[PDB]
Design a protein around this ligand. Structure first.
Ligand SMILES: NC(=O)c1ccc[n+]([C@@H]2O[C@H](COP(=O)([O-])OP(=O)(O)OC[C@H]3O[C@@H](n4cnc5c(N)ncnc54)[C@H](O)[C@@H]3O)[C@@H](O)[C@H]2O)c1
Ligand SMILES: NC(=O)c1ccc[n+]([C@@H]2O[C@H](COP(=O)([O-])OP(=O)(O)OC[C@H]3O[C@@H](n4cnc5c(N)ncnc54)[C@H](O)[C@@H]3O)[C@@H](O)[C@H]2O)c1
Ligand SMILES: [Cl-]
Ligand SMILES: [Zn+2]
Ligand SMILES: [Zn+2]
Lengths: 383, 378
């Protein structure tokens, strides 16, 4: 059965195994009536998933007169496509169609965080705004990037500098996409899942601790023909992933005077972003956020706010899912030959302190990021 | 007297003679607190108006501490600057400042429709959105472009293709800008003023008819550097221009319907413009469109022939063309012809008038292509 989660007081999220394979096309043409559908993705994702959809779309466009059209745009993979150049590329491409794409256009964002931010931003300004849907194909996109409307592209000077808040009409979460997602990317996305649980539900966190071995085994297993990577553990994977997605939706949907409940989502990102500013692009975002979570967890313990046992759980849980819990992680070192993260550099990258503090697994200290002394931060980052 | 109007619920429009010279700076720093203010304009407008403001800003920044900063960006004049390149150059420039312009930045759009659309769009996406104010310097901008939140840039394949709805925090209308606005541009802007009146108030339309000689004289007379072009007729100019502006503001606030009325004379007007541009200006084309669309309604037995004539006399009174055969226009468009086919083709529903200050339907009406032709053809 398809699970539904709402965003900003309305239906928006539809999650299940096989949506892309048999549900999205029909749904779009039905609930997102348009004459034109523009699908944006990269060559990796697309070469694997675009063919089936083209057929499923053709099969759904036929039971209608006249038949809506599906236009496909394949961008090269990587953070590099999240640029002004590609935004203008996709746009001119869309304007140059016969007939050109109009304000009724429904853009389909089939990809991870990169394609998501790019496509969302394209849609936000196309003729001052057109509808679009998110079809996250990475774990991180499913529970984070595709939720909340934050759209943008990069500039040589920094990440997500030019963009917009543009909400998607719908977010289709097809867990089957995780069947072909590279093991490292999957692990990477788990950083947000564990973060979410860590700051919202102790029960959820425990479920993550208990489901690690099973989940990871499935993520690494050799799939025999006729099988689906996650057969046998579908409910576990769905309950775990949707718990995070759902939380993100709740936080983003909760306003009517809140102050900064959204702030708690940055737990582990204060230090995590600092670390990433140095180790990127060798080390992924989640990998850096994982380490940031451990450091920030130690900090709170250092300030006598977090019990030492919670730190250890936080550490075993991340490692159980394959995430690094230290800056000298064997894997990290091999990928970043000649990169060091000195306290000074980290204390610097951070100043460019307010760290969400935890008082217990599933329980934040303040309802917002707390203010901590630079000296206390340095001690934590000491060798 | 600093007049105030409301857009989208409440006040945002401030109109008067001299606002730029001694009010915006203080106002911005007070009502739009920020550490950074980015002024965007073109070399024409800026070379005339940026110096005073710089001083007026410095004079107001000193009163507050630490003193804010004013960053100026001068773009070349023309429709050509309303492009992706200029948007990116402005963005890159802002981000390059030391320190980089943050989300607290308040962008000042000092210019006409071009600078307005460009700057508004820049502001809408800068770090996903930052505040900005409109300081329209052309008549058309004062009563139309600077109002409504419509922002964008052009593409070789068309105008305003990439943009967004981004409302300005404030719209400062300093009528003194019209002192240096080229006569042709001023006349051009009058097309929207006359259009607005034509579809909203018969009294207002009549006031435009009676002010015609006076306004034009002020516009066409030779003013000497130091004397104000509009001394003696300031209330007339203010009441006329603000009337148009306040109406656009009203409709933009109501809301597919009431907004459709704002397009009277633009159905044919845009078709004509698609051919005659860039030689012929938007207002000049909209003027002719108004006459055509007015005769169409007369053709359909909805408009009295007398209203058509008044519409025709008023446009002409203000120096706007009322036919494709206009000498100015023919001379200016040598090498071009608006065949009826091309116009119909370009047209691919017109707002009909039942009387001066009175629309037919509450929205654009559906008319048969044949009735249109018998009105486009000679
Ligand atoms: N609020 C927001 O909008 C927000 C917040 C967090 C992250 N992000 C953005 O997300 C981006 C990173 O996104 P990401 O971690 O999803 O990485 P990504 O989109 O770069 O995807 C990683 C890799 O996986 C491949 N891939 C994607 N789906 C696949 C699948 N199911 N099968 C096979 N290959 C697949 C891609 O081709 C790519 O190589 C960053 O640029 C970041 O700024 C945005
Ligand atoms: N909804 C909207 O936002 C909207 C609606 C209608 C028109 N527009 C757009 O507006 C643009 C047209 O703008 P416009 O007609 O105001 O012309 P414009 O901005 O191109 O200005 C015309 C000329 O006058 C000069 N100038 C401007 N003000 C001056 C002043 N006070 N003193 C001296 N010289 C001055 C300029 O340098 C320029 O050369 C078009 O690009 C059009 O697409 C936007
Ligand atoms: Cl853009
Ligand atoms: Zn993150
Ligand atoms: Zn107009």
């Amino acid at each position: 059965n398809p699970t539904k989660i709402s965003i900003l007081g309305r239906e928006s999220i539809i999650a299940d195994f096989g949506l892309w394979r048999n549900y999205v096309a029909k749904d779009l043409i039905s609930d997102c009536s348009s004459t034109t559908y523009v699908l944006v993705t990269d060559t990796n994702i697309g070469s694997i998933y675009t063919p089936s959809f083209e057929e499923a779309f053709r099969k759904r466009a036929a039971e209608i007169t006249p038949s809506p059209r599906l236009l496909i745009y394949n961008r090269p993979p990587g953070e590099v496509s999240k640029s002004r150049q590609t935004k203008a590329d996709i746009e001119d491409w869309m304007l140059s169609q016969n007939p050109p794409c109009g304000r009724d256009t429904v853009v389909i964002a089939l990809g991870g965080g990169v394609i998501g931010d790019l496509t969302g931003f394209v849609a936000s300004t196309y003729m001052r705004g057109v509808r679009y849907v998110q079809v996250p194909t990475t774990l991180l996109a499913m529970v984070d990037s595709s939720i909340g409307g934050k759209t943008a592209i990069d500039t040589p000077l920094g990440k997500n500098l030019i963009g917009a808040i543009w909400q998607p009409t719908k977010i289709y979460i097809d867990l089957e996409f995780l069947e072909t997602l590279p093991v490292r990317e999957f692990i990477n996305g788990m950083a947000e899942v564990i973060k979410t649980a860590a700051i919202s539900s102790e029960e959820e966190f425990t479920a993550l601790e208990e489901n690690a071995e099973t989940i990871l085994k499935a993520v690494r297993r050799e799939v025999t023909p006729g099988e689906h990577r996650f057969e046998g553990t579908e409910e576990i994977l769905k309950a775990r992933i949707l718990a995070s997605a759902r939380h993100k939706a709740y936080v983003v949907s909760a306003d009517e005077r809140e102050g900064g409940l959204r702030n708690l989502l940055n737990w582990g990102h204060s230090i995590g972003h600092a670390i990433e500013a140095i180790l990127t692009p060798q080390i992924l975002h989640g990998e850096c956020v994982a380490i940031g979570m451990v450091k920030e967890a130690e900090l709170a313990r250092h300030l006598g706010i977090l019990k030492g046992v919670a730190v250890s759980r936080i550490v075993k849980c991340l490692a159980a899912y394959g995430l690094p819990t230290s800056l000298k992680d064997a894997r990290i070192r091999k990928l970043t030959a000649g990169k060091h993260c000195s306290v000074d550099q980290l204390m610097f990258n951070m100043a460019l302190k307010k760290i969400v503090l935890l008082s217990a697994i599933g329980t934040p200290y303040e309802t917002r990021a707390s203010v901590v002394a630079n000296e206390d931060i340095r001690v934590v980052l000491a060798p």
